[PDB]
Amino acid sequence: MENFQKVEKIGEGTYGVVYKARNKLTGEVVALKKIVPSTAIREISLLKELNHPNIVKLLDVIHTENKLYLVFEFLHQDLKKFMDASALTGIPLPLIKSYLFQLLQGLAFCHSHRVLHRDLKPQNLLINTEGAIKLADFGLARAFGVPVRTYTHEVVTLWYRAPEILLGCKYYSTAVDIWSLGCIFAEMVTRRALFPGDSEIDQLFRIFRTLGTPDEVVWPGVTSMPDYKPSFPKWARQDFSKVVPPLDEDGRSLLSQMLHYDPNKRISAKAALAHPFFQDVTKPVPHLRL
Numbered sequence: 001m002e003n004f005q006k007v008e009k010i011g012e013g014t015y016g017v018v019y020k021a022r023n024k025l026t027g028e029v030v031a032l033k034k035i036v037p038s039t040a041i042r043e044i045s046l047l048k049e050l051n052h053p054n055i056v057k058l059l060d061v062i063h064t065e066n067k068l069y070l071v072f073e074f075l076h077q078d079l080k081k082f083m084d085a086s087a088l089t090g091i092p093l094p095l096i097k098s099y100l101f102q103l104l105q106g107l108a109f110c111h112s113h114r115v116l117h118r119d120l121k122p123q124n125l126l127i128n129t130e131g132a133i134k135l136a137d138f139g140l141a142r143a144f145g146v147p148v149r150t151y152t153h154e155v156v157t158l159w160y161r162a163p164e165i166l167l168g169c170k171y172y173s174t175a176v177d178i179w180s181l182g183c184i185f186a187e188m189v190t191r192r193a194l195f196p197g198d199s200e201i202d203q204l205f206r207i208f209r210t211l212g213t214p215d216e217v218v219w220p221g222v223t224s225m226p227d228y229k230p231s232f233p234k235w236a237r238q239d240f241s242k243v244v245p246p247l248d249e250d251g252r253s254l255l256s257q258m259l260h261y262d263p264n265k266r267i268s269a270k271a272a273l274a275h276p277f278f279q280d281v282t283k284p285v286p287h288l289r290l
């Protein structure tokens with residue numbers, strides 16, 4: 001670590017404090033994440049080759065003193081902050097579309113190498129001043145788990161968790177990332193989290209209250225998920241026109257496919273990139289004060 005000068009604390013991530021740091025011998029300004037089991041080291045080393053322009057570059061993995069430090073490319077803002085800052089007029093649609101579109105490319109890339117994020121959230125989606133948006137912390141969940149509370153006891157958000165994870169499916173797939181990104185897409189659009197659950201049950205019930213309590217018709221096998229209970233209330237599905245109003249039909253079409261209950265029906269990242277929603281996609285520059 002002596003090769004890094006901490007510039008400022010950027011935040012408290014899932015696994016440890018995130019610092020803006022400067023690499024003393026490269027001159028590079030990086031994001032330094034203090035997170036070691038051999039399994040975690042080999043997984044993490046696999047992440048170093050997962051390179052894609054909508055994936056926050058993993059510059060180096062420093063394994064010293066028993067201590068694990070990941071050095072990432074530094075972006076200048078996360079999507080939560082950018083949404084919070086854009087709350088008054090919201091993020092212009094063409095920008096939403098461009099981020100969604102680039103996030104899907106980032107997903108398609110990782111998913112094609114069988115790597116899931118598992119923990120997508122606005123805070124791990126980082127934007128630059130040019131209009132790019134990238135996924136940070138890809139593959140970390142599989143390397144070190146997703147805790148209930150972070151190392152600061154901060155509560156890990158459930159707002160973006162796929163229903164098959166809430167239902168205790170142990171073996172969930174790349175569909176959980178599409179679900180999360182669908183939730184983030186809706187939040188960009190409406191400027192309100194779609195499902196801000198504050199407990200697993202509240203999260204699940206929130207889902208059900210909007211999309212209908214899932215049953216065997218829409219999701220074969222749902223009733224035999226580990227945490228499914230026959231006693232769950234049976235809520236009717238709400239129309240998507242009421243759920244993300246502003247959004248045009250191609251947007252709502254795509255979001256309902258990203259939000260399919262059955263993970264096998266849920267649109268893949270690559271099919272989502274061929275959705276007519278992206279027909280006029282462009283790459284606008286965000287209004288970004290740094």
Ligand SMILES: Nc1nc(OCC2CCCCC2)c2nc[nH]c2n1
Binds near residue numbers: 018
């Ligand atoms: N500019 C910035 N921020 C990060 O994390 C912000 C996350 C830190 C967790 C608190 C939410 C903010 C980065 N990660 C890799 N590059 C990064 N660049």
